[PDB]
Design a protein around this ligand. Structure first.
Ligand SMILES: Cc1cc2nc3c(=O)[nH]c(=O)nc-3n(C[C@H](O)[C@H](O)[C@H](O)COP(=O)(O)OP(=O)(O)OC[C@H]3O[C@@H](n4cnc5c(N)ncnc54)[C@H](O)[C@@H]3O)c2cc1C
Ligand SMILES: Cc1cc2nc3c(=O)[nH]c(=O)nc-3n(C[C@H](O)[C@H](O)[C@H](O)COP(=O)(O)OP(=O)(O)OC[C@H]3O[C@@H](n4cnc5c(N)ncnc54)[C@H](O)[C@@H]3O)c2cc1C
Ligand SMILES: CC(=O)N[C@H]1[C@@H](OP(=O)(O)OP(=O)(O)OC[C@H]2O[C@@H](n3ccc(=O)[nH]c3=O)[C@H](O)[C@@H]2O)O[C@H](CO)[C@H](O)[C@@H]1O
Ligand SMILES: CC(=O)N[C@H]1[C@@H](OP(=O)(O)OP(=O)(O)OC[C@H]2O[C@@H](n3ccc(=O)[nH]c3=O)[C@H](O)[C@@H]2O)O[C@H](CO)[C@H](O)[C@@H]1O
Ligand code: NA
Ligand code: NA
Lengths: 386, 386
């Protein structure tokens, strides 16, 4: 047949499943993708005026402690030695971040040793016991105290969730957000970097296989009856929206979206670092990205007098908005459980598997999407394709 | 013969020359080393109470942009992804360091953008033109201004050189010590790391070759007549003290030395970072090293409640002191030039080559010592050994 497997959507989940079927099982794979490009939200592109690599669906930082995933992705791209670091703008000062000896010195006004800082945090957070916290605000305060909470957590969180923190689950904070050293590496994972030639090249390499066919600008729901009629026995891996697949018969799942305001400025350097969080309520955006600093190794390909920045705004996803993060209200969790029963039935009657961020109503980092695809491949598709 | 080449001293210079003669030319090499161990000052050892890897002749950080040197050293050890970062203690606060947007924010009290910081530094340093500077103090001020100079440069420099900065060469500062971004990587080199199994294992691996013989606890001047009588045609590579070789016939070359005060403390973490500079005059030492933080990958081999620190004191080297840094007074430069003429004559009459830090009266980083040895090997010894 012209294909043995259909994959709907070309994000990291779809690409991984398609590439494994194609290279490990020698199967013909047809990838159907609604957008004009591969890669889903991890896709990146050159900004036209400067040539700087930018993102239109959020900045993407790759990090993992999963060696199998790391070895896998390195078949398709090399990675730079980039290490993500973040700074937090509060009341006119850029603080070292996350909370650690650096921020503590800057904020409380003098140097605390590791043991002194531990004692300071005990004092500050004495007010509430975390076992007694009834919401996010109380849980946060019970861990780090009111001054730290009100300076670095309250408004940022309120901007991100569009909700007063008094009205968020205490379960949204599960550990001490404070380091008792000067380590300001943002991620804690064994492996980290950015694709040397950009995400578009990486993701394109995954789909670049003699056994893989890609059809862009193609909505699964517009072509599915025709495609499956060509080969009825071919399974489908669907990574599109779960609720939309079942015609919203159980309701609309709720998502948060993001607005990106991207500007080219006539300066070589706007903030001197890739990411600046804006922790104060007076700024509508949660953070600014300056894309050139993600690839300092490309400095003589970058313009000396221009730079691209991007401001990030968070809000509820309405119709026409890109759905990015599941809201997960108990109402959402309910209709999800109902959709899971429909999906499971659809798998056994129609050989349609559900995966990925949209297909399962679950936020997935890139390495988690890859791990999840590797697992579906190993545990389900090898058997379904013989 | 029992050896084709004699190498005096087993620092990075000696080891490199010995290993190249042994592996590339297939020559028998005898290494003579005065101390009880290999490696010269780069040698490291376990502290007995904690097992933590420490140094007795200064902390050693490996960094280079020389790819040939990098590829060479990786034949003998793997390197961690360690990146050196330093903090500067001034008036009770730990500043981000070297001078950049971080320090500038902390010190001047609010966030300066890259362009604003450039303008601030122009204002601050307007007082003196660097073309008019007559000493180190003026040259420093002409570049970064009096407040920055007096807070972070004056006392530290005075402690290191044991001299008022008004009495040091304006030529000791040759570029703007300020970054207009948030990058606080201490070194600017392409390659950087620490030997995964420590310096002792690395340096021991260099000498570990079927063609290499090592004699520790052996002073060249006590054994040389006997050794050379065994094989008169064998060249000598001498990395011992240049002036001592010629019986101080032209005077004693002047060196600075260091005192190290090493303590085991009953805490798991003293300062939360490998190196803290102490920039104020009230502290006699220039910096404190906390050795465990150089190898965070060894954390579950390190004790949870103890740590080794080391305070570093600088002073003129007297007899009995380890000579570490050439002072290079014009008086020193004079007798050096005289010793160079003696050495050059000794090379052509006695086949004794002079290299390394002590042999040439020149401070050499490890990669520069290796590069210098590789060059002497390529340009002199290949010919001298055929
Ligand atoms: C704002 C944002 C920032 C992120 N930052 C990071 C980060 O820093 N680090 C990290 O590791 N991960 C990050 N991620 C996650 C990253 O994008 C993952 O690769 C992604 O979640 C992988 O899941 P997926 O492959 O299922 O998703 P998707 O990327 O969403 O891919 C799904 C694809 O299916 C297509 N599709 C949908 N419906 C149809 C249909 N009917 N027909 C055809 N095609 C269809 C879509 O067009 C899309 O291309 C971020 C995600 C977002 C949204
Ligand atoms: C305090 C300090 C800190 C340093 N920190 C760094 C750092 O962070 N990064 C970096 O890249 N480099 C650093 N270096 C430099 C590093 O030690 C180099 O490897 C060294 O300078 C290499 O030069 P060498 O091999 O000639 O020197 P040496 O290490 O001095 O080796 C010379 C050897 O010759 C032996 N010897 C002398 N006389 C005789 C004799 N008569 N007979 C027999 N043996 C003899 C000595 O015992 C010694 O082992 C540091 C050096 C010092 C002193
Ligand atoms: C957009 C995105 O892909 N986010 C993911 C990414 O970012 P992060 O979790 O690192 O970024 P983040 O800023 O979105 O989330 C951290 C949370 O901590 C709080 N906070 C954070 C910063 C600050 O200055 N102040 C403050 O209060 C806030 O409540 C926020 O929700 O990696 C995480 C760990 O892998 C999660 O997977 C996140 O979902
Ligand atoms: C001990 C040693 O091996 N030093 C070497 C190493 O350390 P560094 O040069 O990085 O360390 P350093 O502190 O010894 O020297 C920097 C100089 O800047 C000044 N200063 C520095 C720090 C500070 O807080 N305040 C201040 O005023 C001071 O005048 C000092 O002499 O690498 C350098 C670059 O490769 C040189 O090779 C040095 O010789
Ligand atoms: Na508490
Ligand atoms: Na000036």
């Amino acid at each position: 047949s012209d294909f043995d497997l259909i994959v709907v959507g070309s994000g990291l989940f779809g690409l991984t499943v398609a590439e494994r079927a194609a290279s490990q099982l020698g199967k013909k794979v047809l990838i159907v993708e609604k957008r004009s490009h591969l890669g889903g939200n991890a896709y990146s592109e050159a900004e036209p005026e400067t040539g700087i690599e930018i993102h239109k669906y959020g900045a993407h930082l790759f990090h993992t402690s999963n060696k199998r995933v790391w070895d896998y992705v390195n078949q398709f791209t090399a990675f730079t030695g980039y290490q993500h670091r973040v700074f937090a703008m509060h009341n006119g000062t850029a603080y070292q971040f996350p909370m650690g000896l650096g921020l503590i010195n800057q904020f409380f006004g003098r140097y605390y040793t590791p043991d002194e800082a531990r004692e300071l945090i005990k004092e500050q957070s004495a007010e509430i016991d975390s076992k007694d916290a009834t919401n996010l605000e109380e849980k946060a305060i019970s861990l780090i105290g009111r001054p730290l909470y009100e300076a670095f957590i309250r408004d940022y969180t309120a901007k991100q969730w569009q909700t007063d923190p008094k009205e968020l689950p205490a379960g949204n904070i599960t550990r001490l957000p404070v380091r008792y050293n000067f380590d300001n590496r943002y991620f804690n994972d064994t492996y980290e970097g950015l694709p040397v030639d950009g995400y578009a090249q990486w993701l394109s390499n995954m789909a670049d296989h003699e056994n893989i066919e890609v059809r862009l600008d193609t909505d699964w729901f517009e072509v599915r009856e025709d495609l499956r009629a060509q080969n009825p026995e071919a399974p489908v891996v669907y990574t599109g929206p779960l609720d939309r697949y079942f015609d919203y018969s159980e309701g609309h799942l709720g998502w948060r979206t993001l607005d990106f305001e991207t500007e080219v400025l006539n300066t070589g350097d706007f903030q001197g670092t890739p990411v600046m969080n804006y922790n104060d309520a007076e700024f509508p955006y949660t953070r600014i990205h300056e894309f050139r600093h993600f690839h300092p190794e490309r400095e003589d390909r970058h313009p000396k007098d221009k730079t691209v920045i991007m401001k990030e705004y968070s809000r509820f996803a309405e119709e026409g908005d890109e759905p990015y993060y599941p809201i997960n209200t108990p109402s959402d969790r309910e209709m999800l459980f109902k959709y899971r029963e429909l999906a499971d039935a659809e798998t056994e009657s129609g050989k349609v598997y559900f995966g990925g961020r949209l297909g399962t109503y679950q936020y997935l980092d890139m390495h988690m999407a890859i791990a999840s695809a590797l697992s579906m491949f190993d545990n389900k598709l090898v058997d379904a394709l013989k």
